[PDB]
Structure formats: C-alpha cells, structure tokens
Amino acid sequence: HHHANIDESKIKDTVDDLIQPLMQKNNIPGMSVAVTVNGKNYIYNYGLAAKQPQQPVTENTLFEVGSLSKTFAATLASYAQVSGKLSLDQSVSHYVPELRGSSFDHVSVLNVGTHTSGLQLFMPEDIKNTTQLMAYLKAWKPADAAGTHRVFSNIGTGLLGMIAAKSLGVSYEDAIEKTLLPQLGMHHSYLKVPADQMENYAWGYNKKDEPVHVNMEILGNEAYGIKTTSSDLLRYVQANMGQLKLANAKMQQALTATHTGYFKSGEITQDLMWEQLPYPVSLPNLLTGNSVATPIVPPLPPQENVWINKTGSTNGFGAYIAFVPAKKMGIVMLANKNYSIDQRVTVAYKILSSLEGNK
Numbered sequence: 622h623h624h625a626n627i628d629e630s631k632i633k634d635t636v637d638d639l640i641q642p643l644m645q646k647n648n649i650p651g652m653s654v655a656v657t658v659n660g661k662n663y664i665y666n667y668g669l670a671a672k673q674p675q676q677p678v679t680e681n682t683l684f685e686v687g688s689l690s691k692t693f694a695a696t697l698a699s700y701a702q703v704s705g706k707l708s709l710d711q712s713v714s715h716y717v718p719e720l721r722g723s724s725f726d727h728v729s730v731l732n733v734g735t736h737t738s739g740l741q742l743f744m745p746e747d748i749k750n751t752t753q754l755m756a757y758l759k760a761w762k763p764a765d766a767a768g769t770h771r772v773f774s775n776i777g778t779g780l781l782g783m784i785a786a787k788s789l790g791v792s793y794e795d796a797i798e799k800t801l802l803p804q805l806g807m808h809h810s811y812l813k814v815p816a817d818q819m820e821n822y823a824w825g826y827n828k829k830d831e832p833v834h835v836n837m838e839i840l841g842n843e844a845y846g847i848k849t850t851s852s853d854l855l856r857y858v859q860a861n862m863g864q865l866k867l868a869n870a871k872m873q874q875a876l877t878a879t880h881t882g883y884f885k886s887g888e889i890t891q892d893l894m895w896e897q898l899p900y901p902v903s904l905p906n907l908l909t910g911n912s913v914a915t916p917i918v919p920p921l922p923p924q925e926n927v928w929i930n931k932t933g934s935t936n937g938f939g940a941y942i943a944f945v946p947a948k949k950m951g952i953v954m955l956a957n958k959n960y961s962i963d964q965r966v967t968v969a970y971k972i973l974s975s976l977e978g979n980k
C-alpha cells in the first residue's frame with residue numbers, strides 16, 4: 622500500500638513513473654529495478670518473467686546480465702592481484718606459456734582488463750575447444766599495437782578471467798561460483814542455473830519477440846555467463862561502495878581496486894572493466910559516452926566523486942548498473958528484452974537524480 626512520506630513509496634512513485642512507460646514503449650515483458658540509498662535497499666518488480674505460461678517477476682527472478690559479467694572477471698583479477706598472485710602489468714604470455722613468442726608477449730594483463738589489447742569483440746564461432754583457441758591466439762596480430770586503442774572484447778575478458786583463475790589455482794567457473802560470489806554473499810547468482818532455480822530463470826525475448834536463453838560457448842562465462850537477481854546485484858553495488866561487513870579485507874580491496882582509472886577514451890575513463898565519468902554528470906556526456914586510448918599514469922585511484930557504470934546485453938536481455946560512491950547510491954535495472962542503452966542510462970539518471978535535493 623502507498624504511504625506518503627515513507628521512503629519505499631516515494632521511490633516507487635519515481636521508479637513506476639519511468640519504468641512503466643519504458644516497458645510499454647519497448648515491449649519489455651518484465652523488469653526488476655533495485656535502488657540503494659542511505660544504506661537502505663528497495664526492490665521493485667514489474668511484469669512477466671515468462672509469457673506462456675505466464676510467470677511474474679518476483680524477488681527471485683534470474684535475468685541474464687550479459688557484459689555485466691565482465692565486471693566479475695575484473696573483480697576476480699583484482700582479487701588475484703591484491704592477493705599477490707597476479708601482476709596486471711605483466712604480459713599475457715608470462716601467465717599463458719603456450720602463447721610465449723606470440724603477440725601476447727606484448728599484451729599486458731591490464732590490456733585485456735581494459736579492452737586495450739586490440740582483440741576483436743566476438744569469439745570466432747568455429748572455436749570449440751582450448752586447442753583451437755590456443756592455435757588462434759598464437760597466430761593473431763592486431764592492426765595497431767596493444768595499448769593504443771580501446772576495442773570492447775569478449776575474447777580479452779575471457780583471457781582476463783582465465784588468467785586470474787589460473788593464478789588462484791582453479792578454473793574460472795570454480796573461482797566465480799565457489800570463491801567470488803560466495804564471498805560477496807551473492808547466493809542467487811550463477812554461471813549455470815541449478816535445477817531448483819530454473820523456475821525462476823526468466824525467458825529472454827529477442828528482437829523478433831521469440832523466447833531465448835543465452836548459449837554458453839568457449840570463454841563465455843567470463844564475458845556473458847552471469848544470471849542473477851536484482852537483489853544480488855544490489856548487494857554487489859553496496860559491496861563496491863564499502864557498505865557491507867562482507868569475503869575478506871582482501872575482497873573489499875579487490876572490489877575497490879577495480880575502480881582504478883587506467884585509460885581515457887573520449888570523455889570516458891576506463892577502469893578494470895567498469896567505466897566511469899566525473900560526477901555530477903550531465904545526461905549529454907552520458908549519452909555521448911555511448912577509439913584512441915590514452916593511458917592514465919599513474920592510474921587514477923578509486924574515486925568517490927564519479928559515476929561508475931556498466932551495461933550488459935544478450936540476445937534476450939538488457940541490464941544496467943550505475944552507482945555514485947560519494948552519494949552511497951546505486952541502481953540495478955534488469956529487463957528480459959534488449960532495449961537501447963540510451964534509454965537505460967536516461968532512466969537511471971532520472972531515478973538517481975531524484976534521490977536528493979538540488980544544491
């Protein structure tokens with residue numbers, strides 16, 4: 622029931638007023654929106670996780686988050702780094718000996734963690750096993766030197782997560798599901814959804830409105846494997862702002878260190894997978910932010926006065942996270958349809974702007 626002067630009702634009015642038109646105009650079947658502010662958490666669910674048979678979005682609904690998954694690979698690499706198992710400045714071939722003598726002699730772990738290796742976006746479809754993957758990587762050359770350009774890459778994120786996990790002595794799937802997500806308290810987050818949670822796994826709806834789930838291929842866990850709830854992602858946002866007891870002291874340091882600013886591209890600062898802009902942000906630069914890479918050396922330390930964000934999509938889903946550490950506020954928006962990023966950022970901006978007076 623609605624209550625004037627009560628936090629959850631005031632926030633719900635703002636969120637409803639933006640999310641309901643957004644879902645109608647984009648034919649989005651279902652969404653969950655989670656907001657944190659002043660140490661308190663608010664979860665709002667809309668519409669349907671599945672159309673036939675109809676299933677509503679609930680607090681337990683799992684959505685694919687696509688490239689939001691890359692921030693977990695970055696957090697894992699950061700955890701390995703602060704634990705003394707990984708140096709980001711070292712070469713990929715230092716950690717992957719089969720690539721010694723290849724172009725990866727000249728690509729750093731930082732490069733694959735910042736989209737500056739030059740590797741292309743998509744893994745070639747005919748690469749099915751590790752032998753084929755290694756043959757490909759051993760024979761690969763970019764047109765420009767590593768460290769000169771930003772090119773978003775699923776392959777690079779794959780290497781980042783693989784190297785991080787190996788430096789901890791485990792597979793990536795083990796590192797994520799047995800170490801990272803449990804230490805973060807994210808008990809409803811998965812690379813592979815278990816049988817008791819399949820009833821909660823929303824269907825995605827593609828551009829043709831067909832129900833789809835993402836097909837996991839080689840190194841896909843690192844780049845697009847996470848299925849999760851808005852509540853678990855809100856915990857992840859809070860952890861990224863140091864708000865939770867948590868994990869480890871090492872885990873808090875790992876999360877914070879992913880916000881280190883390593884390269885500038887246009888107006889955007891590239892962190893370890895996360896991207897950030899100075900806060901306050903005007904909506905135009907947010908939209909303009911969605912290339913030559915200039916190093917930030919020494920790296921920009923993790924900041925409070927920034928808007929940190931990441932989009933992610935699969936064929937059937939569209940996700941977004943943004944948070945402002947200086948304001949201890951953040952938002953997670955999950956949808957089971959891939960709708961345009963300009964709308965994700967605009968709605969998030971309007972919601973977060975609503976959470977305090979102008980001054």
Ligand SMILES: C[C@@H](O)[C@@H](C=O)[C@@H]1NC(C(=O)O)=C(S[C@@H]2CN[C@H](C(=O)N(C)C)C2)[C@@H]1C
Binds near residue numbers: 691774911931934935
């Ligand atoms: C699953 C993946 O195939 C896709 C993402 O969900 C692609 N990978 C990336 C990526 O994020 O690295 C974007 S590009 C986009 C370019 N800037 C975005 C971002 O982080 N924003 C807008 C905050 C990300 C592909 C669709």
